[PDB]
C-alpha cells in the first residue's frame, strides 16, 4: 500500500473475526518506509502516422 496515511499509534493489523479462513489481512504501519525506484536507461520516442 503506498502514499497513504499512517497509523497514529503503533502498527495496526485489521482482519475479520468470524473464522480464521480469511481472504485479506491488512497491515497499516505507523511509520513509512521510503522506496526509491528508477528506470536508468534513456529512450527515444518515435511516431508512426
Amino acid at each position: 500500500l503506498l502514499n497513504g496515511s499512517l497509523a497514529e499509534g503503533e502498527i495496526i493489523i485489521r482482519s475479520e473475526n468470524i473464522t480464521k479462513n480469511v481472504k485479506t489481512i491488512i497491515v497499516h504501519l505507523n511509520e513509512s518506509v521510503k522506496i526509491e525506484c528508477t528506470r536508468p536507461n534513456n529512450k527515444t520516442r518515435t511516431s508512426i502516422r
Epitope: 468470524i18 473464522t19 479462513n21 480469511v22 481472504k23
Partner: antibody, heavy 122, light 107 residues
Framework: QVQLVQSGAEVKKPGASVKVSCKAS????????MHWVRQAPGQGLEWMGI????????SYAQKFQGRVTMTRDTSTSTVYMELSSLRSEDTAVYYC???????????????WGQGTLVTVSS | EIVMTQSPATLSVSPGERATLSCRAS??????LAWYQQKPGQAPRLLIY???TRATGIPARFSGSGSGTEFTLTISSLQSEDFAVYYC????????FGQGTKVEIKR
C-alpha cells in the same frame, strides 16, 4: 441456473499424469473461489486445494504438495487440476465445487459437480 | 489440524421415527459447523450451515443444535428418502471433514 460440468478420465499407469477439469456457469466466474476435494470408495473425505479464478493464486494441502497443480482460464469459465506421479492410492472420485462468500472471509458451499473418476492401475 | 469425529458409525432407524446423529471436535469450531447429505451414486447436498441454520430448500423435518466441541443433528419422522450418509464439516480453521456416519433401515 448454477451448474458445474466435469469430464471423465481413463485408468493411468503408475507414475503417469492425469488432467481433470470443471466448467461452471450461472454466476460470474471471477467472482468466487473454487475447491477441489477427494474421496475414495470406503474412505472419508479430504480437502486438496483452492484456486482463485479472479487472478490468481492457489493454496494446497501439504498432502499433495508438489504433486498437484492448478490453473484457470477466465475466457472459458473453467478450472483445471493436474496430478503428477500417480499411484493406486489416488484411485478416487474427484469433485469440484463453488465456494461461498465475497465479503472478506470464506465459509462453505452447496454447488457441487457430479464427480469424476480417475483410476490408476498396472 | 482440526480433528472431527462422528458417532454412531451406523444408526438403525425404524421409518417414521425421529433419528439422531452427533459430531465431536478436539478444538473449538463454535462459530461454524455444517452438515451434508450424501446419496449413493450422486454428489452431496448441504443441509445445515451456521451450526443450526437450515439450507435453502431443506424441509422442516431437518434440524439440530450445538456449539463449541459438540453438535447433534435430528431428523423428525425419518422417511425412506432420508436414509443417507451424513457428514460434519468445520469452517473455523483450514477446512477438514469428519469420517461420516450412515443411517440404515431397521428390520
Amino acid at each position: 441456473q448454477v451448474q458445474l460440468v466435469q469430464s471423465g478420465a481413463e485408468v493411468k499407469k503408475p507414475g503417469a499424469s492425469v488432467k481433470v477439469s470443471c466448467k461452471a456457469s450461472g454466476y460470474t466466474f471471477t467472482s468466487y473461489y473454487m475447491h477441489w476435494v477427494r474421496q475414495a470408495p470406503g474412505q472419508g473425505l479430504e480437502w486438496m486445494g483452492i484456486i482463485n479464478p479472479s487472478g490468481g493464486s492457489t493454496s494446497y494441502a501439504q498432502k499433495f504438495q508438489g504433486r498437484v497443480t492448478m490453473t484457470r482460464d477466465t475466457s472459458t469459465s473453467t478450472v483445471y487440476m493436474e496430478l503428477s506421479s500417480l499411484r493406486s492410492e489416488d484411485t478416487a472420485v474427484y469433485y469440484c465445487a463453488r465456494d461461498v462468500g465475497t465479503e472478506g472471509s470464506l465459509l462453505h458451499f452447496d454447488y457441487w459437480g457430479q464427480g469424476t473418476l480417475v483410476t490408476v492401475s498396472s | 489440524e482440526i480433528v472431527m469425529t462422528q458417532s454412531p458409525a451406523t444408526l438403525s432407524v425404524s421409518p417414521g421415527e425421529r433419528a439422531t446423529l452427533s459430531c465431536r471436535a478436539s478444538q473449538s469450531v463454535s462459530s461454524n459447523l455444517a452438515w451434508y447429505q450424501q446419496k449413493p451414486g450422486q454428489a452431496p447436498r448441504l443441509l445445515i450451515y451456521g451450526a443450526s441454520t437450515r439450507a435453502t430448500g431443506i424441509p422442516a423435518r431437518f434440524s439440530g443444535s450445538g456449539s463449541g466441541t459438540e453438535f447433534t443433528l435430528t431428523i423428525s419422522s425419518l422417511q425412506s428418502e432420508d436414509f443417507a450418509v451424513y457428514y460434519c464439516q468445520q469452517y473455523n480453521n483450514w477446512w477438514t471433514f469428519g469420517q461420516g456416519t450412515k443411517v440404515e433401515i431397521k428390520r
